[PDB]
C-alpha cells in the first residue's frame, strides 16, 4: 500500500474552484515511492516550479486550477513490481 | 447502443440529497429494453412503480433517496445476447 488513501475501484470526488489551489491528495506512506500524475485519458502532468508541486506528505498541489483540471485525475506508483492507482474525479464547487 | 448516453470508463457525477428525488438518467433507445439498476458491488434495486420508478425515456426515478443510494450506481441491459453497462457516481454536496 504506497498511498495512505487508495481509491482504485471507485474514484474519490473532490471539489475545485477555477483560479484556486487544488490538492490531489495522493500522499504516500514512504518517501521512496515515486508517483506520476495523469489526467485521463491522454495527459501526464509533471511537477514544475510553482504550477504543479509534489509534496509526499500532501500529494500534488496545482497552484491555480482551471477548467482543464476538471475530469479524472490519477496518481500512479510502482512498488514491489505492482502498479497502484488512486483515482479522483474533480468538479466545480 | 442500448443506452442513449454511455458512461463506462468515467462515471457521470450525479448530485443527490437525502429525502429528495434522485434521477439516474440511463434512458434507453427503445422501450422494449429491460434495464437492471445495481449498486456496486453487491445490491440490485428493484423498481416497484412508486418508490423506484422506471421510465425508458428518463432512467430510474428514486422518490426518497437515502444514504444507501450514495455511491456507484450501474444500469445494465442485455440486448442481442450482449450485456451493456453505464455508470453513475452519486455525490452529496
Ligand atoms: Co501480486
Ligand atoms: Co455477438
Ligand atoms: Co459537487
Numbering used by the authors:
A (entry chain C), B (entry chain A): 133 to 225
The authors write:
Three receptor types have been highlighted: VEGFR3 (also called Flt-4) regulates lymphangiogenesis, VEGFR2 (KDR/Flk-1) is the primary proangiogenic receptor, whereas VEGFR1 (Flt-1) has been proposed as a regulator of VEGFR2. In this study, we showed the presence of a metal site at the dimer interface of X-ray structures of human VEGFR1 domain 2 (hVEGFR1d2) solved in the presence of different divalent metal ions. The three structures are similar and reveal a homodimer with interlocked hydrophobic surfaces buried at the interface and a divalent cation chelated by four histidine residues (two from each monomer). Importantly, the dimer interface involves residues that lie in the core of the hVEGFR1d2 surface that interacts with VEGF-A, VEGF-B or PlGF.
The structures of the P1, C2221 and I222 crystal forms were determined with four molecules, one molecule and three molecules in the asymmetric unit respectively. The Co2+ ion was coordinated through the Nε atoms of the imidazole groups of His147 and His223 on each domain and by two water molecules to form a square-based bipyramidal regular octahedron. Three additional Co2+ ions, which exhibited higher B factors, were present in the asymmetric unit and were also coordinated by a histidine residue (His214). The metal ion coordination site is octahedral for Co2+ and tetrahedral for Zn2+ and Cu2+. Superposition of one hVEGFR1d2 molecule of the Co2+-bound and Zn2+- or Cu2+-bound dimers resulted in a maximum rotation for the second molecule by 12° and a translation of 2.4 Å. The mean estimation for ΔG dissociation was 12.7 kcal.mol-1, 58.1 kcal.mol-1 and 18.4 kcal.mol-1 for (hVEGFR1d2)2-Co2+, -Zn2+, and -Cu2+ respectively. To verify that the homodimer observed in the crystal forms existed in solution, we performed SAXS analysis of hVEGFR1d2 in the presence of 10 mM CoCl2 or after thorough removal of all traces of divalent cations. The SAXS results unambiguously indicated that 10 mM Co2+ induced a doubling of the molecular weight and a significant increase of the radius of gyration, confirming the Co2+-induced dimerization of the hVEGFR1d2 domain in solution. Theoretical data calculated by CRYSOL fitted well with data measured in the presence of Co2+ (hVEGFR1d2 dimer crystal structure) or in the absence of Co2+ (hVEGFR1d2 monomer structure). Other divalent cations exhibited little (Co2+ and Cd2+) or no effect on the competition assay (Fe2+ and Mn2+).
